[PDB]
Amino acid sequence: NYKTKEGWDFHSQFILYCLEHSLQHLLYVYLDCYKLSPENCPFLEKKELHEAHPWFEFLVQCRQVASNLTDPKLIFQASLANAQILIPTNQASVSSMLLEGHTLLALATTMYSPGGVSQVVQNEENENCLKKVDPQLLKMALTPYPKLKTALFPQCTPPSVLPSDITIYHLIQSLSPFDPSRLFGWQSANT
Amino acid sequence: QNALVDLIRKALRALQGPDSVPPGVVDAIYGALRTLRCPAEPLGVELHLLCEELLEACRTEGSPLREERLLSCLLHKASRGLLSLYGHTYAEKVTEKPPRATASGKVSPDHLDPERAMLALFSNPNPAEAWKVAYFYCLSNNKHFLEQILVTALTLLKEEDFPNLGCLLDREFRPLSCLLVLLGWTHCQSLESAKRLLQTLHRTQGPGCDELLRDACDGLWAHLEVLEWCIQQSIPKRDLLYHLHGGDSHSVLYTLHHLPALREEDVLKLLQKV
């Protein structure tokens, strides 16, 4: 039999003050005492406060994905919240570490997220801002990833032939004196 | 406040075993603790010590103390900052008993790497507990799950540990097992290990993985079959691994020449495969 004119509650204010105490797992225990959920409480999704209290967004995503972390959707939301909490960027995500070079976290976040890795390999028109990265910063900053770069994106080479590491004289030389270098100098293929 | 804190500290530290708690560890220990303003700001080791005491105590039961009822009746002016200190030292205690292997008691965590605790958390049957551990490690130990996970993944990929990768990626990382295998592949030297890595990670990275990654695993197995066909038709492991790690530039003809009356049929079949 309690209320107010404004609209807050000693439990509304209790969660708010736990935020004023900046609680995540203690706030999670209180949430379980209320048995909280991914979105059952419409008042706990203040994007301004979510990023600004990145710990609070991390806890909310923790409830959502401890309810279900297997799904690419809820798990992707949890990963984005974790990136916002850890990476202090106003837009902190896979791209924040990618452009900076830490493509490891970039791939980890992009494995099961909107758009997708093969989609990025092909299509870059996904309006989801979380599915894009700064291209050159990450690219030159993806230096320790030769094999990863080759595997992720096919090389858009023209119809011209790629490197052919064997020559006619060369592959012929596997027959010992039959290395065609001793003659046929007018033919480059017998290199 | 320090002495009342210590009165609680006695009542608890003594309750820390099996002794029966007399009257006071259920009301007077609580009152003495409530009389303790062991406050925020830079303080001595006692504040964080008793904070970890209540918290790692909330990691226990049987006698009358915790951080739980502590928080219930311990919201005051000089306590929210100590609560934050309890968060830091409580991440410390939960990492102290790190991810508990009750079933696997043979493993000794006296000098164990973080890989075991991390894999146990990933494949844990408690996504709530796993997520709580990850969030606490991020907050009070400065470790993103993704960065450490990917570093350890590249580390395991360089060595080609198939079944363990299939097991741990089955927690959540089925999608990216093939990608990790591809990142570490140029660092491989044995055909059996490579096939095992592709099977238990890249093939384990099935539909949940990218099409390009599993396609690369399939093309690699096909190339391995073609190479086995050539080896049957025809060994320098140095030249073999040189071609293999360098196959991107090393032409198949380059490698084969690098390896008249022989089995033109065997090589012809190997080529007709392509």
From Swiss-Prot, chain A:
Top-level taxon in the UniProt lineage? Eukaryota
Q: Where in the cell is it found?
A: Cytoplasm, Cytosol; Nucleus; Cell projection, Axon; Cell projection, Dendrite
* Tissue-level expression: Expressed in all structures of brain, with a high expression in cerebellum. Expressed in cortical projection neurons.
- SUBUNIT field: Interacts with AP5Z1, AP5B1, AP5S1 and ZFYVE26.
Disease association reads: Spastic paraplegia 11, autosomal recessive: A form of spastic paraplegia, a neurodegenerative disorder characterized by a slow, gradual, progressive weakness and spasticity of the lower limbs. Rate of progression and the severity of symptoms are quite variable. Initial symptoms may include difficulty with balance, weakness and stiffness in the legs, muscle spasms, and dragging the toes when walking. In some forms of the disorder, bladder symptoms (such as incontinence) may appear, or the weakness and stiffness may spread to other parts of the body. Amyotrophic lateral sclerosis 5, juvenile: A form of amyotrophic lateral sclerosis, a neurodegenerative disorder affecting upper motor neurons in the brain and lower motor neurons in the brain stem and spinal cord, resulting in fatal paralysis. Sensory abnormalities are absent. The pathologic hallmarks of the disease include pallor of the corticospinal tract due to loss of motor neurons, presence of ubiquitin-positive inclusions within surviving motor neurons, and deposition of pathologic aggregates.
Q: What does this protein do?
A: May play a role in neurite plasticity by maintaining cytoskeleton stability and regulating synaptic vesicle transport.
Please state what the protein is called: Spatacsin
Organism the protein comes from = Homo sapiens
Question: Which lineage do the record's taxonomy fields give for this organism?
Answer: Eukaryota, Metazoa, Chordata, Craniata, Vertebrata
Whole-protein residues included: 979 to 1169 of 2443
Swiss-Prot record, chain B:
**Where found, per UniProt?**
Cytoplasm, Cytoskeleton, Microtubule organizing center, Centrosome; Midbody
The organism sits in which domain of life? Eukaryota
The modified positions for Phosphoserine read: S108
Tissue specificity here reads:
Strongest expression in the adrenal gland, bone marrow, adult brain, fetal brain, lung, placenta, prostate, skeletal muscle, testis, thymus, and retina. Intermediate levels are detected in other structures, including the spinal cord.
User: Domain text from the record?
Assistant: The FYVE-type zinc finger mediates binding to phosphatidylinositol 3-phosphate and recruitment to the midbody during cytokinesis.
What is its quaternary makeup?
Answer: Interacts with AP5Z1, AP5B1, AP5S1 and SPG11. Interacts with TTC19 and KIF13A.
Function in brief: Phosphatidylinositol 3-phosphate-binding protein required for the abscission step in cytokinesis: recruited to the midbody during cytokinesis and acts as a regulator of abscission. May also be required for efficient homologous recombination DNA double-strand break repair.
Disease field reads: Spastic paraplegia 15, autosomal recessive: A form of spastic paraplegia, a neurodegenerative disorder characterized by a slow, gradual, progressive weakness and spasticity of the lower limbs. Rate of progression and the severity of symptoms are quite variable. Initial symptoms may include difficulty with balance, weakness and stiffness in the legs, muscle spasms, and dragging the toes when walking. In some forms of the disorder, bladder symptoms (such as incontinence) may appear, or the weakness and stiffness may spread to other parts of the body.
The protein's name in its UniProt record: Zinc finger FYVE domain-containing protein 26
Taxonomic source organism: Homo sapiens (Human)
GN (gene name): ZFYVE26
